[PDB]
Design a protein around this ligand. Sequence first.
Ligand SMILES: Nc1ncnc2c1ncn2[C@@H]1O[C@H](COP(=O)(O)OP(=O)(O)O)[C@@H](O)[C@H]1O
Ligand SMILES: [Mg+2]
Ligand SMILES: [Zn+2]
Lengths: 173, 645, 200, 195, 193
Amino acid sequence: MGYYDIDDVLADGTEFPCKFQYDIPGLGYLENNPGRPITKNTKLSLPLWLARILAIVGVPFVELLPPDMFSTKVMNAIKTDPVALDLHSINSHFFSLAIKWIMLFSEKELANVVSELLLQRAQELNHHASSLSIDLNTNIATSTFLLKLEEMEKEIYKKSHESYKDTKRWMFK
Amino acid sequence: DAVFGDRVRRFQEFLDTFTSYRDSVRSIQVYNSNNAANSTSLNILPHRIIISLDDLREFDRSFWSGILVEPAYFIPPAEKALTDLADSMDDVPHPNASAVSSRHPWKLSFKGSFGAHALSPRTLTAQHLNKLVSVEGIVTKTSLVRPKLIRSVHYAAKTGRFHYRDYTDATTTLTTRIPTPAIYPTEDTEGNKLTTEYGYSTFIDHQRITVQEMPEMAPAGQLPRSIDVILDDDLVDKTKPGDRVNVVGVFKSLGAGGMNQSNSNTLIGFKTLILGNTVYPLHARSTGVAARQMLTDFDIRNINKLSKKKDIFDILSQSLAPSIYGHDHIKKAILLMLMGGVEKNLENGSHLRGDINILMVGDPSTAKSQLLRFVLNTASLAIATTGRGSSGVGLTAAVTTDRETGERRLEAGAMVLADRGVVCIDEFDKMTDVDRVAIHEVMEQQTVTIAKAGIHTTLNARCSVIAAANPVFGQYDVNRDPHQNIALPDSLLSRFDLLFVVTDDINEIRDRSISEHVLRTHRYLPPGYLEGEPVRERLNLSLAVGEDTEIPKLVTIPFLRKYVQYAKERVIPQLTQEAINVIVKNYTDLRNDDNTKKSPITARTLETLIRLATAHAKVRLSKTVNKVDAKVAANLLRFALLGED
Amino acid sequence: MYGDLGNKLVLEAKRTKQLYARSNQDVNLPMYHEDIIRNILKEVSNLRKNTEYLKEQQQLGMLDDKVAKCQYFVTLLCMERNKRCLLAYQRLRTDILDSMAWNNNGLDLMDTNNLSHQEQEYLKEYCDLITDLKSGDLVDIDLSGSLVPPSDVFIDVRVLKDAGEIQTEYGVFNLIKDSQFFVRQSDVERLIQQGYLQKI
Amino acid sequence: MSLPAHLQQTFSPEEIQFIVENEPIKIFPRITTRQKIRNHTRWQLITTDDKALNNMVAMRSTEVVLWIALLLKQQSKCSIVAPQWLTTKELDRKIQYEKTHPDRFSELPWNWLVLARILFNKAKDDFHDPIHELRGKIQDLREIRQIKVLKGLKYLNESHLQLDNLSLLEINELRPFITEIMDKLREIHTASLTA
Amino acid sequence: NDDDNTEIIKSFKNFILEFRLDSQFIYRDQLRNNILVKNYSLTVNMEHLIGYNEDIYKKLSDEPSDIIPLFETAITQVAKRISILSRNSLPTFQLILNSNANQIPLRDLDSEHVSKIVRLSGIIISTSVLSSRATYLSIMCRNCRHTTSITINNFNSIVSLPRSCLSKNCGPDPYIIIHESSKFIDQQFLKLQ
DNA sequence: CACAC
DNA sequence: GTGTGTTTTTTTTTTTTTTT
Ligand SMILES: Nc1ncnc2c1ncn2[C@@H]1O[C@H](COP(=O)(O)OP(=O)(O)O)[C@@H](O)[C@H]1O
Ligand SMILES: [Mg+2]
Ligand SMILES: [Zn+2]
């Protein structure tokens, strides 16, 4: 959560569904009505970095609604088959946003689910990372699994696979 | 068989844990009992229960894993447990002297998340045999519904006793058992003659359909692959060819694969198929919703509120194809077609069709095909056709032979499948003349007739026809009358409600606006996509299987589809004298008009006016037609004919 | 909303991050995106003008604390986010420039058109600072030397680019092209770094 | 930056080799540096003790730092002695011990893999055992330890971990993955425990 | 025949465990990596096997249809040894070969070369759908209910249900396939031009 | 497969 | 009692090809 983390910066600017609590005047600069105000009980999508502050200061101005990524459907999908889930399709920065949402809401069950998902997928990505192709003179499963990773999983995978490749190169040099 | 009883008891404990299934069973039983106690009634509820896999996983992960890994040893115990539970809480009414003999096993159905078991016919590898899988596809072939014996009842007219003999097949029961020779025992063990007691014997409806993957996820250079599914009991006739569907069932294997001294070295494989347990009819090409889209009360209220908008017609027309610049009146006509006027089923065999058929002919690269593609992507029931890529036999009805039974049968064509739907025909001028008479008969009387191969039938295709056409020359010649510019008979043109002429005249301001709009369209970037990144498609959005004032410029396409469905279902407009005066006045003025000399205006134009007025009344959700409907219909027809405004 | 420019800028920044991350291609920085910088600067200036406008209009007018506080706070948070995006992009460029300077201090001092004037001056002074650190107290050791352990002392090398004759510490090296030396790895590290000798 | 990204928190295998190069090992000097009672320059180093080097006697085993022994082994002026764990019997006993206890690692010296690689590369002819068998047994031990590591990975908790008796190279190669997964699991728990 | 089969299997197991060019057991590493990604197969290069021992290559080339299943069994045993701690249910691995022999023209295939090893070229013109061939076949005796299992090599010699009860007579065809317990693999038919 | 040759 | 023998199909519908 460092200030200059590029992944954190990208994750901050993600729209989230959230209704309003006041008929606040003069807002909507790019929300389809620059001069016209924003009405009470209005459901709009707002960037997470701004919605975070707007959800605490106030009764808070904005009531955050549960996003589609953390709906009970996705929860059931995660609890069913963590390995065969294309989490990249759900979002490129799913784990960071899960961490931020849990930190804001102290929602322990989501944290318990996401930790299990992370462990189960870490097992498989380590299996793939330590698998090094050797030329007798890019496996199909490797690539078809790599597309279902967020940037952090793609980063841990790159680092671990680089370490494995360096070890193999030094060992057999 | 101790494991069987253990699974039965754990399943019953799970059922008691979630009483919602018990309530559903109670509702089904009381509904059936009330219908039996109540007449021209035939709607009886089935003995099937839909459970969510998520609840089973939360309760007992071992049982859920056994279900999803080796269902042949876990679902039969669950069915036994459900039957025992149903009997225990059954209202124990007076027996019919048949239900005691006619068994009624309570089928199981599943929904929710499936993970890696959500597959397609192409990806259904042999490793998934004996494993419960969910496969999406299109219904293409459907065998005839054929009942089969599972239990025969016999009466001994020397002892007054009833003997039952249960019949099992590899395609009926999941667990493998010795096949029964399907012979009725006419004699008792003690030399007593037995009479087969039909009605007390038990037969089940059986069907065998073919499910093939999407053509659009079919990989480059490969044709779609297909699998065979065996729907049984309730699931028969629940689907028809051309339906998108997701089936949940066991991937079973059958056959001998040689291995019988008939084929020792011959390398033939085994028969593989699916015993369907659940059918979910995803449709409308939205990948996750059915054609009969569910309407929430909020959506209905919003639809009613938007119906009070003055120019809701224009808003919906413009919201149809935002990426297609201009062609506003064409969009209005398309919206009228999608949700058309009333069909008059008059007496004495008279029939006035309510569908609107429009032929639009125009210059090349004028979005003629793109409009039809959009209508295909939007309409609830839309079938694509190409004039070159179509045969009349493959368009209306094909005389094939059945394989399950081995005898002749008819298969629906392109328009019969589109009954109550829309047919989008591109390259209409390129259609074969010999098969063009068939579509002429369709658009004339909405029915086809077959009198070949000892089959004399009349099928109903009450579809709405939209056609895209090109001029006889490479481009339209305005110096020539609109008869030689079209290579189609005027009788064929007559049945069309509207004929739209599209001219690609080279303007400068209009050309600039078109170019700017097209560039805005081409520079669009999908939300979850980066610049310079190929737009890959997976469409694995089935994370769970099954059901699991205001003045906006443009409404969302699914919301528009919901509005169209609600309007088609609910409002049945009535033509009004105030509309009658306007309609008759406009028809008279157009008929005896000097500029209308080149027009084919006849009595059919009056039918077109009535249909347009009814469709416009449907647009306003008014249960009766009004003057504004007639005025708008007259203006649109006058635009279609003359084009001045 | 308002952070779209910063969002595109940080997306490009991460793109450059993966670009330089792959192997060790030692590519020059992508051209300074002065366009996005100027656009977001104009956005920030307009939002600052809006803040001043709201302040003066609240002073002259009768605006309750609710709207005056809320719009001003939202705009301030908008500047916070945009400034953070700019800071992240500039920090990425600074760190990659640091990498180029540290690795190439003994290699080469170079297309500078991809960098802004501030970045060019930063690199020019940072080379001076690195040299000052090398010559200050830790001059006995070479701070810019190779970070790989000196596993072997004597190695063989082949001349890639003929440099005629170059005086080494004690003798002299006749860097005839397509000729192979077998000498100490210690006194030829800089030449190999520059790209004159190839074999290990 | 001053430190390249791939060297941020882990050691490159070359660094592990360099670290292991400072371990003392027993060798047979092929020269005799013992200046008799009846000039020459002593090693007089500062990273190690020169006393043994200045007093080497031909074919009399001494103990010196590993990398000096390798430098001498560049010529035929020395000879490396394999440690007692580099015998076929000890390797077989360790194999049996590993196969006997599936949940605990063998008690090998922490630098066994790198030492084996270095000795095989540069001292391939100083073993009483067939080198083609030693290589196979070393590879078998590496595979068995990998299999054990993978099974021990299925219990990655969020508090701590005990990798007992594990070697150095395996730890170095597994550091970037385990130390990063453990960080994310700790962060999730801490975010949950924000009350 | 069992002694010869064990001899060949042990020889191939030794070849897998020992073959290496320079300090790297190439086949061991390849097998481990393939197991890591659930790829139960192995690409064996022909020159490597030839260089290891010419006798093994000659025995393979004489009767490949009988030698290859033993090689697959040895591969499975090696996989169990070096991928699972002793003290199952692992499918039999599929062997893949690579060679540099002279490519025989397609029309040059004749009455000879039968049951030999042939290398050739062509262009694919037809790819049928995937059928299923059984490898593990649970089978049930019809009358006395004596259940057993059968293992199929899928390498046709030049197999059917047993023609006896094998423990009352139960008939000459007393066996029925137990589909829910058997194991199958995918098979595809191609047409080369 | 099974009843008839 | 060992081993057989059926039931079992070439329509209608596409696509090509030569005349016309
Ligand atoms: N009015 C229009 N607005 C936007 N695009 C258009 C328009 N007219 C034509 N096009 C473009 O022309 C292309 C080809 O159109 P097409 O459907 O082939 O027309 P036709 O069937 O008349 O040849 C389409 O990609 C479409 O984007
Ligand atoms: Mg077109
Ligand atoms: Zn028997």
